[PDB]
Write a protein that binds this ligand. Structure first.
Ligand SMILES: CC(=O)Nc1ccc(-c2csc(N)n2)cc1
Ligand SMILES: CC(=O)Nc1ccc(-c2csc(N)n2)cc1
Length: 171
C-alpha cells in the first residue's frame, strides 16, 4: 500500500504546539522546518513527479493578540493555485523510496516575481500537501496527502517570540 510518512514529525509538532509561522518575503524564503517525507508502496519500476502545494485552512485570517492567535477578520481572495515541482521529477519509484524526499528549495513569497516561488497571504493558515503524479499515464493518476502536523500561518515577520527562539534553536 502507498504510504507517505512525515519525517521529523516530533520537530513539526514542537512548532505546531506554539502555532507555527513561516516568513513570506518579496524574493521568497525557504521553510524551516523543511518538509521531508518517506515513501513506500510506489511501483519501483514506474516514473512519478512529486508536487507540493499549500491548502488554505480557514474562511478567515488570523491575528496575534495578547500572545494568542485569534480570528483576525475576513480572508483575502485565495492565493493563486501555485504548485512546486520537486526538482528530482520525473523519477523512478525506486528513487523516491530509497531515501526521504526533501522540499528544501521551495520559497514562500507575498509577491508574484517568478522563480518557482509559492505565493501565500500573510496572516492566513495553510496546510502543506504533496501530490504524486504517474508519468506516461493516459488516466494521469495522481495521489494527494496533507500533513496536519505541518500547518502554519504565513507572516511577514514572526509574531510569537517563542517561534523566533524555536527557529534559532533547531535551525
Ligand atoms: C496548479 C494546479 O494545477 N494544481 C493542482 C490541480 C489539481 C490537483 C488535483 C486534481 S485531482 C487531485 N487529487 N489533485 C492538484 C493540484
Ligand atoms: C486525474 C487528474 O486530475 N490528474 C492530475 C491533476 C493535476 C496534475 C497537475 C497539477 S499541476 C501539475 N504539474 N500536475 C496532474 C495530474
Amino acid at each position: 500500500e502507498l504510504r507517505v510518512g512525515l519525517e521529523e514529525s516530533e520537530l513539526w509538532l514542537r512548532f505546531k504546539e506554539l502555532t507555527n509561522e513561516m516568513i513570506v518575503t518579496k524574493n521568497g524564503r525557504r521553510m524551516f522546518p523543511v518538509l521531508k517525507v518517506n515513501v513506500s508502496g510506489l511501483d519501483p519500476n514506474a516514473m512519478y513527479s512529486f508536487l507540493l502545494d499549500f491548502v488554505a485552512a480557514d474562511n478567515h485570517r488570523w491575528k496575534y493578540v495578547n500572545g494568542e492567535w485569534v480570528p483576525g477578520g475576513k480572508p483575502e481572495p485565495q492565493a493563486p493555485s501555485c504548485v512546486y515541482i520537486h526538482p528530482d521529477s520525473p523519477n523512478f519509484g525506486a528513487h523516491w523510496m530509497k531515501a526521504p524526499v526533501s522540499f528544501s528549495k521551495v520559497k514562500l513569497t507575498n509577491k508574484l516575481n517568478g522563480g518557482g516561488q509559492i505565493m501565500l497571504n500573510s496572516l492566513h493558515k495553510y496546510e502543506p500537501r504533496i501530490h504524486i503524479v504517474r508519468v506516461g499515464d493516459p488516466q494521469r493518476m495522481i495521489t494527494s496527502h496533507c500533513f496536519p502536523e505541518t500547518q502554519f500561518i504565513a507572516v511577514t515577520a514572526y509574531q510569537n517570540e517563542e517561534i523566533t527562539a524555536l527557529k534559532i534553536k533547531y535551525n
